[PDB]
Design a protein around this nucleic acid. Sequence first.
RNA 1: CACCCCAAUAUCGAAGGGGACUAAAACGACAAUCAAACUC
Length: 1215
Amino acid sequence: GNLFGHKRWYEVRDKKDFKIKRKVKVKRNYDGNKYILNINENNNKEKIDNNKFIRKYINYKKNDNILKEFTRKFHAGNILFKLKGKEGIIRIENNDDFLETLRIIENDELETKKSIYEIFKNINMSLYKIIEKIIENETEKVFENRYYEEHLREKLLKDDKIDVILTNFMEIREKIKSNLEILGFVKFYLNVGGDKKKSKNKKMLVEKILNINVDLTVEDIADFVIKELEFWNITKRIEKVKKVNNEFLEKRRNRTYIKSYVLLDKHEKFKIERENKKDKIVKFFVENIKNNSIKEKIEKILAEFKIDELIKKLEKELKKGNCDTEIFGIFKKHYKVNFDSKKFSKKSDEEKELYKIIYRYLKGRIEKILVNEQKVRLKKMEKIEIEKILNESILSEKILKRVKQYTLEHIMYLGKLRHNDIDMTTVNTDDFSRLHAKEELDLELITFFASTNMELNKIFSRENINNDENIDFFGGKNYVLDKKILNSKIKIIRDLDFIDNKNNITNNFIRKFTKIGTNERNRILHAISKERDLQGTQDDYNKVINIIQNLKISDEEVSKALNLDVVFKDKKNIITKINDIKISEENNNDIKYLPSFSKVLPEILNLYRNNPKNEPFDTIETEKIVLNALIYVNKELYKKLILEDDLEENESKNIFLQELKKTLGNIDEIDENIIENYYKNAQISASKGNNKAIKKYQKKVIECYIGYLRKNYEELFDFSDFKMNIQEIKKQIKDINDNKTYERITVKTSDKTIVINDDFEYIISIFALLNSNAVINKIRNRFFATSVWLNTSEYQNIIDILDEIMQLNTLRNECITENWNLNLEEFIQKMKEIEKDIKSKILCRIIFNSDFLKKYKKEIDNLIEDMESENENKFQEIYYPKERKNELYIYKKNLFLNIGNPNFDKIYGLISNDIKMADAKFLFNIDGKNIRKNKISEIDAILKNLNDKLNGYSKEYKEKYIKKLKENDDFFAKNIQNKNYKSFEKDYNRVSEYKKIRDLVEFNYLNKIESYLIDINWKLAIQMARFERDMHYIVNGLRELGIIKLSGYNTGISRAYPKRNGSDGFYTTTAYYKFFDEESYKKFEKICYGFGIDLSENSEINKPENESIRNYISHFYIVRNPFADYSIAEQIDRVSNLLSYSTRYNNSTYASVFEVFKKDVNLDYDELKKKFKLIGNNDILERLMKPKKVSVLELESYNSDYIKNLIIELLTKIE
RNA sequence: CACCCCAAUAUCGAAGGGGACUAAAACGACAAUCAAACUC
């Protein structure tokens, strides 16, 4: 359980009626110099006396609440059935059941039910008694355990009258099962039931009772009993506190508790302690590790421990069959006999700690087995043996590594304090948390700097023939343009004044951009700290060019009517109503907390289809052309409804936000800024390990917005009249070019006010302008997440900026591809573009590139071209008209977009052949055309209900009910349709077969693959950045204790460690810190090597160019050059080792990566917890990933095998 | 194979507990298996 958690165990009397006892969650809060205890409820935040509190905790922990509690909530005849009477007697057994006792229907005859009524009571009464006796047992044996609920369960199951109850239930079931429709209606009814307050737990056990299609096992009933028993907090564990003999030792006991539980923590211990004792042990340890004196120092003490008897000593109890805390005794007892005593011995403090470290480590292994034994008894862990959890050889290796971690953490903790400059006297928990927040932002920012350097490398390359090596623009100067520049870049680069006319490099780029970028890169890295600092470099004129650049990208609204208002010309009327909404640009600050429109989109989609009235969608065109216009309007309506300012005094209507704040808050108390507090509370929950915290809050906001859409904008989805077209195509064309009739309906399009206030906002916005939307997204949301966590408004501007640069990026991509192009006469367009070698026509064609178009045509042609006589209609109307062939090219946007993309040719392989095979039934079959319109959804609708019906039921139950549904066709028929299951299964694979092909032919796989490359490389990027940060901690820590000597700072060197590039004085030249003499560095490098960090070239980090893991990842060569030289797996291995200096990071890498694929494979998390190298051997290894399931059911996904293998290829491919 | 931390502690019913303070998770532009009795 928990104190200072969600369990409410602490008890405070209710204010309205003093007698009533109300239960509260209580917490620790730092008051300034010390922790204090506050109650932690929205209603109450009162301080708690430490002394009152500790006693209550101890009192709470031993209280025999349970018997009074079980009776207080329950009595026979209210325990389940609520079959009760007694003529004014509240609870009793056996007596006094009052036995044999808008439309009203009374009928004759149903004699039998009276027979079953009694059956109810024989049921409920037996149950109450069964429990009472067990609670009545004694100690109890049952509730004195840590896994008490399970013991209760085994006792409940075993050798009890419960089995008769199953028989009674079955008997009740049998009469209902066949004989009377009424019997079922009634049999269910005598359950409370529906109204007051009831526990989902009960409803499901009812739902199993009222169902004869599913079997009922005695297990289902027992499980209900404990769950009901917990549900009402009747059942708790009885744990006796340490025994004490008089008040003076009781006083001492309660004081160390208050220390252990309320008073101290990592920081608090550090502050009080302890005349320099800790530093000495760590100093003691570092030397011993360097010496190699250590292993035998541990290896000997381990034997003092005498493990083998302990393994024997432990084994004996486990067979005793409790599977509990008694294990710690056998351990506690064993230590007492083998070890002192007190006489042995007066020993060095450093020596003593190895005993504590060893002791408490092995006490951690005693938890390993105990956790396992519970984890083997239920389902499968499974069946691991002590024998090789204690493994004196394995233990020796593990124990050593825990000693280096201890020694390491302390060094780093001091360094972290040092490098930041937090005062060692006031360190507290509150400061450390807000330091985490930025530390997280800092890792992201640096990675951001490192992608923009990757982008800059492509645009810019060294003048000399000699070096093809990376250019570190920041932290660095006679650059010359790269040979392979996109020419998309020059326009941005030219605009920025980075490039002089003729493409020669600008003066400004050297001071304005590079100088600022580096100083800014170093404020992040060096915890600077200061004025920031440029009085300084950068000016509004310099800045204004940036603002003007952002403004230029946006297409005007008038242009962005290629979503055909033909659609809306019905129906003109809603559009004026929306523009007519008045909003204020204040930004409110509520808006930040609401979901992205991307979240709400699907429901908006969902409703329009869900709405009954709308007609079937013709081909498509139309649906693509109807939804898209609708989505964009909804996207801009989502925003206007949020920014709407308060309505004028005579409107009945509620502004959307006001309805939302009213829904989330209780009635009559609607005076609050509750939106923010829900997000902030939901963000904290997520922090403490509730991953649904933020989705659950989101979907509320959505539900409420979807409501608001239905109530005020119903017509926008109400489309009684529509046509499949061409008539629409005609409509757009007939409409198009009636230039004299220029005017088209348009959405408001807002207005733009970009402003820059610092040099920092301007390097970032520039950087934003330089790399992909996927990347700017990651650091945007990190700007967001920090601002909320720290409750600052520093970053709000750059967010708005970064938002704008993005909405402009993805709208420009709306206009140009569909409208400016595609020309559709590609050989012609290439000569139309080559002739070319705000506005939409028109110039945005800059993005259009001749080489790319040629490539696009060529790759499509490869797909189209027939081999031999064998030719094809297939791919018709997908890539070509219709008619025919080369005359026109269809715009498969997914293919056209990107093709950046050094990767693309490499990435495309393993898609490219597979594209050719797929038949187009898209097209191809009326069945194929049919599958989309009626049926992709038909299944989704069917799976949905099944999921909803199922949820919260056990896997064991779901499994049979599911088998029963497969097995009995008549049972299956109700839900959903096309009974039986066999028929459904075939429609499922049918859609499963539509979606497989569809994904290849629009090349959805490029998107998935291109995403995998950036995420994986991005997290791996974070991680080298963490390592770099750590070295600063290691140096600072090593220095703060007097174990290393530094005479200087080489400011303007980012890195904390030096190269052997030298030749001499490299140590005081290479690194940010300055070392006194080789000895200093020679000692440093050695202490480091002790922890698994190899600082002597060439050691992974220092291999000359792109040979170090560091350089390969940090220069982003998994997105730009995949598969060259090294397997992605090879490299995932090689970082997972570079970080092996700190157990904290164990399988940090592996986990990090495979969650990039969580969505499209079925990760075995158990097997991701074990040790492994993917890269070497371990062919068997994935394994790590299993094919995806859904329908729960667990039906194989439309692309389960293909995607999972696609990934496998991706990682391993090494050519 | 998570990791760190909490005593009078080498060891003492810590057989307890803390952890935005630490990784992982989460978040992420465009984009899915998980009081009682009376009132209904």
